[PDB]
Structure formats: structure tokens, C-alpha cells
């Protein structure tokens, strides 16, 4: 029967959506990738030098599908963990804002994310349709 993103494991669905977005030539990566920490909390760029932006976009799209609507600051709160503040106690450091802004604009160009009246951005019918389609892809991929 029909299948939503809630019926598929998070990590596998996100990996498959990243792979599918990477395979097709859409979802342009900003020219400043390979450069950025992705947050003040981190101290190195992603280990996967190329393709990590697709993973982040997949995670963002799944997050907007699951939740009500999400802006950029909320994603900054979501991503980013604890900064090793040298010899001081760790705290919570918000993620980089430019990366998430570019992710949301790229998702807008792909048509998967729509601007919501209540502020932030919500899921769009076409994009959520592709999300269910690739959730089915992963689910019948499992067995």
C-alpha cells in the first residue's frame, strides 16, 4: 500500500535522497562549498568533500516534510552540536546560516519547498510527491 516518509528509516531515506539528488544535475551547489566548516561548532569541513551538500539538502527536505514549517534559524538550531571551546565548558553553537539559506533556496528552485504564509518554508505538493516516491524506492529497495 501507499507509503510516506514516516514509514522508512531516517538514515537510509536521507542517504538515498542524497544519492538521487547527486545523480541528477539539478540542485546547484553554492560555489563556496569545499570551503566552509558548516558551523562554528565544527573544526573541520565535512569528511565527504563533495556530495555532503546533497546529504544536507536531503535531511532538510525530510525535516520540512515531517514538521510544520521550518525557517533558517530553526535549522541553525537543529544542526550544530557542541564546540570544543579550548579549555572552557562546551556549549551549544548554532549552525552556519548561509549554508542552510542556500539549501532552502536550492530546494525552492527544485520546487520541493514552498514559502509558507506563517513564515518559514513548508513542503510543496510536487516535492512531497517526489519524497514519497523515493521513500517507496528505498522501501522496495530493502526487500
Amino acid at each position: 500500500p501507499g507509503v510516506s516518509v514516516r514509514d522508512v528509516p531516517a538514515q537510509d531515506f536521507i542517504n538515498n535522497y542524497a544519492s538521487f539528488l547527486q545523480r541528477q544535475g539539478k540542485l546547484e551547489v553554492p560555489g563556496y562549498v569545499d570551503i566552509v566548516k558548516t558551523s562554528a561548532g565544527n573544526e573541520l569541513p565535512p569528511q565527504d568533500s563533495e556530495g555532503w551538500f546533497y546529504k544536507r539538502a536531503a535531511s532538510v527536505a525530510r525535516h520540512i516534510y515531517l514538521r510544520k514549517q521550518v525557517g533558517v534559524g530553526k535549522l541553525n538550531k537543529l544542526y550544530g552540536g557542541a564546540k570544543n571551546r579550548g579549555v572552557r565548558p562546551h556549549k551549544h553553537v548554532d549552525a552556519s546560516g548561509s549554508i542552510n539559506r542556500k539549501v532552502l533556496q536550492s530546494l525552492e528552485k527544485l520546487g520541493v519547498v514552498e514559502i509558507s504564509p506563517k513564515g518559514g518554508r513548508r513542503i510543496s505538493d510536487n516535492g512531497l510527491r517526489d519524497l514519497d516516491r523515493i521513500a517507496a524506492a528505498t522501501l522496495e529497495d530493502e526487500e
Binding site: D34, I35, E43, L44, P45, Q47, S49
Partner: protein
């Protein structure tokens, strides 16, 4: 998945910018062993040079070394930003450089002797060998060794 790695060509020692570097370490962390180059800067230099990140420094070829070397002396040519550079705005001539193994320590020494000569409080504190950035010294750094 795995390769025999062509016995008889894998280098074990290298001399990049007149410092001996062991080549068996990962490329970025092997480059980290030269003064003025850290894991972040070496990682970015390796990324821009298109050499494999997970490769071993003792197994990449010679023109790879010279291309990496060329990238990491004039970074601004290869789209390394104005920031992320070691010494930016360069208060001798205003051109953002990046100091290296001998150059880093040497130029730090000229900056130190400039601060000594200028008779700044920071300079005389450096000349004395005391803490500079304004930390308490009643209990901090009470042992030379």
C-alpha cells in the same frame, strides 16, 4: 577495495619546502607537519589540488607534490579566499600572505623585534618573557618548564 600499491614506488620520506616529512601518514596530516600549515589549511590545499583526500603522502606522484607546493605558496591565485589565510593585511606592505615553515618563524621574529624596538607595552612584555594577552600571573605560569 584494496591494491598491491606497486611495490617499489611508494615513497617513505619526502622533502617538501625544505622540511623532512614522513609520507606514510595521510596526505593532509602529513602536510600538517610543516610549520604554518594546520589540518584545516592542509585539507583545503589538498582539496584544491584535486589529489585524493584518503590517499597516502608517500604514494602520490611528483607533479602532484609540485602542484600542491605551488598552490600553498600563492593561495589567492587558486581561489583560496582573502580570509582563511595565515597572515592577512600584512602590516609591512598590506598584501595578505601566508607564512610557511621558515618564513613563519622568521617573520614572527621580525614582528617580535619590531614590538621590542617600538617600545610598546606588549613589546617589552614579550622581551621580558611574561604573559602578554592580559592573564593573571600570581598563579599562572609559575614554572618555566
Amino acid at each position: 577495495s584494496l591494491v598491491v600499491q606497486e611495490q617499489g614506488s611508494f615513497q617513505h620520506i619526502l622533502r617538501l619546502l625544505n622540511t623532512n616529512v614522513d609520507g606514510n601518514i595521510n596526505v593532509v596530516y602529513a602536510l600538517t607537519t610543516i610549520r604554518g600549515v594546520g589540518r584545516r589549511y592542509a585539507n583545503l590545499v589538498c582539496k584544491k589540488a584535486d589529489v585524493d583526500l584518503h590517499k597516502r603522502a608517500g604514494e602520490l606522484t611528483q607533479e602532484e607534490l609540485e602542484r600542491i607546493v605551488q598552490i600553498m605558496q600563492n593561495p589567492t591565485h587558486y581561489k583560496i579566499p582573502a580570509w582563511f589565510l595565515n597572515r592577512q593585511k600584512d602590516v609591512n606592505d598590506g598584501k595578505d600572505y601566508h607564512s610557511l615553515a621558515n618564513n613563519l618563524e622568521s617573520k614572527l621574529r621580525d614582528d617580535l623585534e619590531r614590538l621590542k624596538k617600538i617600545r610598546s607595552h606588549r613589546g617589552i612584555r614579550h622581551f621580558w618573557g611574561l604573559r602578554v594577552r592580559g592573564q593573571h600571573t600570581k598563579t599562572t605560569g609559575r614554572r618555566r618548564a
